[PDB]
Amino acid sequence: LGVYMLGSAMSRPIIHFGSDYEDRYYRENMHRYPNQVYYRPMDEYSNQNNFVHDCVNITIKQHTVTTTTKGENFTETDVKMMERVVEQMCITQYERESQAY
Amino acid sequence: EVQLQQSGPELVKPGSSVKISCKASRNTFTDYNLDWVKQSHGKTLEWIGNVYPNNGVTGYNQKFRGKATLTVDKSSSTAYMELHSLTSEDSAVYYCALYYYDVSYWGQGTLVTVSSAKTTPPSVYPLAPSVTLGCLVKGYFPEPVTVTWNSGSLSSGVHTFPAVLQSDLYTLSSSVTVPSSTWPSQSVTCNVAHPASSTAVDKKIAPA
Amino acid sequence: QIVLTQSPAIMSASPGEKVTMTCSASSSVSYMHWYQQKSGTSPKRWIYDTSKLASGVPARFSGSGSGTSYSLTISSMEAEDAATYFCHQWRSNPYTFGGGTKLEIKRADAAPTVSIFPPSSEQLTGGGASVVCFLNNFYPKDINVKWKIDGSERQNGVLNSWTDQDSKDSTYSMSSTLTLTKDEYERHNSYTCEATHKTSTSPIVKSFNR
Numbered sequence: 001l002g003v004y005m006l007g008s009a010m011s012r013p014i015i016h017f018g019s020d021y022e023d024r025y026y027r028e029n030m031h032r033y034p035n036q037v038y039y040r041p042m043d044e045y046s047n048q049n050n051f052v053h054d055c056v057n058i059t060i061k062q063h064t065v066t067t068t069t070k071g072e073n074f075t076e077t078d079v080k081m082m083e084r085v086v087e088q089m090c091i092t093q094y095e096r097e098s099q100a101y
Numbered sequence: 102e103v104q105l106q107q108s109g110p111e112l113v114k115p116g117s118s119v120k121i122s123c124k125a126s127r128n129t130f131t132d133y134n135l136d137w138v139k140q141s142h143g144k145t146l147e148w149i150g151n152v153y154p155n156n157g158v159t160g161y162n163q164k165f166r167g168k169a170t171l172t173v174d175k176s177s178s179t180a181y182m183e184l185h186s187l188t189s190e191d192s193a194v195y196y197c198a199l200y201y202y203d204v205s206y207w208g209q210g211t212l213v214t215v216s217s218a219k220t221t222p223p224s225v226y227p228l229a230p231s232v233t234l235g236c237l238v239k240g241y242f243p244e245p246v247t248v249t250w251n252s253g254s255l256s257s258g259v260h261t262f263p264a265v266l267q268s269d270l271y272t273l274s275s276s277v278t279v280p281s282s283t284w285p286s287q288s289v290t291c292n293v294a295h296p297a298s299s300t301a302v303d304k305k306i307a308p309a
Numbered sequence: 310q311i312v313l314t315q316s317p318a319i320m321s322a323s324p325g326e327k328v329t330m331t332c333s334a335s336s337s338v339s340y341m342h343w344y345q346q347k348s349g350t351s352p353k354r355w356i357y358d359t360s361k362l363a364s365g366v367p368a369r370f371s372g373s374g375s376g377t378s379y380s381l382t383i384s385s386m387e388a389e390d391a392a393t394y395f396c397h398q399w400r401s402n403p404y405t406f407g408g409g410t411k412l413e414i415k416r417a418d419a420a421p422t423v424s425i426f427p428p429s430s431e432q433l434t435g436g437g438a439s440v441v442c443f444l445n446n447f448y449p450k451d452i453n454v455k456w457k458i459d460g461s462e463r464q465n466g467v468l469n470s471w472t473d474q475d476s477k478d479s480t481y482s483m484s485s486t487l488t489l490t491k492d493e494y495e496r497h498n499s500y501t502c503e504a505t506h507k508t509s510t511s512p513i514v515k516s517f518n519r
Binding site: 136145147160205210224228230233235264267272273274276309 | 357403409430468483
């Protein structure tokens with residue numbers, strides 16, 4: 001776990017899914033999803049998509065272990081939705097690292 | 102093939118509380134949403150809150166916080182709405198509504214009447230003179246009563262009129278047209294059920 | 310609290326007519342949903358996600374709209390479609406409904422079939438005396454009922470109740486119940502129920518002797 005960087009908090013974005021049922025679900029469940037991401041350092045990556053892919057998997061993983069000690073459970077609708085919001089977040093974290101810092 | 106069954110009508114005293122149920126049957130969805138909606142005097146619809154019954158999550162309309170409490174028994178697929186500290190404005194029909202993407206089901210509603218009045222059963226009187234017969238269902242509290250004819254075998258030409266209220270007591274009527282020649286020759290019964298008192302009354306129409 | 314406003318509030322249409330009703334939002338929603346509710350029944354989802362028909366909803370229905378203006382159209386009005394339609398949004402908490410459009414169907418005028426019934430012997434046995442008049446399968450809704458007990462009107466002691474428009478034949482129906490004490494009932498003889506209505510240009514009389 002000492003190989004990972006941890007980013008500071010961010011506002012979770014609103015994601016749109018193509019149906020009202022999913023849009024309402026997301027917005028009603030989104031507080032259960034992460035608002036910070038885990039990543040590997042930038043100097044290991046050639047391109048943005050590879051960083052985003054790892055950041056996504058690392059972050060989902062830690063979040064699913066942290067919160068099943070809590071006593072949360074995730075449906076598969078929740079893991080798909082985390083996949084989408086965490087991707088966006090990993091993208092923002094990449095832009096923080098490379099432009100803003 | 103999924104269906105929602107809600108619990109029966111309640112007469113509650115002002116100040117008390119009640120709890121109504123909504124049980125989802127033959128369901129096979131993992132994560133669906135269950136809304137609760139109130140309807141006041143046959144018209145205006147208001148959303149109260151929701152529960153996702155398969156892990157935890159619960160939403161309220163601000164207006165009903167302190168008034169409704171939503172929970173779920175996910176061992177028996179039954180969802181509950183507690184209503185605290187009732188008054189006359191809480192008299193209404195309450196609905197649970199299931200949603201899963203394209204699919205939607207609504208319960209048949211639960212009538213809550215908030216009143217300090219006392220359950221009273223109706224008296225059923227037959228109306229004897231195609232020809233027309235009826236039943237007069239008079240002096241009951243609270244709503245609802247359901248009226249059948251020959252247990253539902255008689256559906257064509259039935260009119261059942263909405264109840265109206267006279268001095269804390271409801272009165273309704275139902276009328277039925279049947280062929281000139283099936284009556285009196287064939288047996289005409291009107292069956293009335295008052296679920297609050299748990300009376301069921303079968304009055305035969307015989308010619309007067 | 311996105312407010313939803315529906316117009317018109319009441320609408321009448323002829324069989325075959327194109328009918329449109331509108332739902333307007335005080336702010337932008339992404340999608341709108343519409344419910345149908347007939348008399349006695351619970352609401353049922355009719356169109357969801359703005360333009361998708363729920364199961365068992367006839368093809369002649371359609372929905373559209375964007376931002377703050379949404380409409381429900383019926384390309385050809387049928388008697389079955391007489392009902393109340395509500396819009397509803399899930400854009401933000403609290404989720405709100407519109408106040409409904411009540412849709413009725415025009416039909417060729419029909420006269421009521423009138424039946425009067427004396428009190429049953431059960432009723433007289435225990436207390437009182439309710440004389441009931443049924444007035445059935447008429448159009449249009451506007452009717453009017455007077456009782457006569459031996460040639461004298463009575464307004465006090467009379468419960469009226471109307472049905473909503475029938476889905477099959479689009480008629481309306483009323484019951485008027487005159488209720489009296491046994492004593493006052495056995496003090497008189499002739500009992501007339503009497504209705505005024507567009508169809509006839511003279512009262513519809515039904516009576517009995519005691």
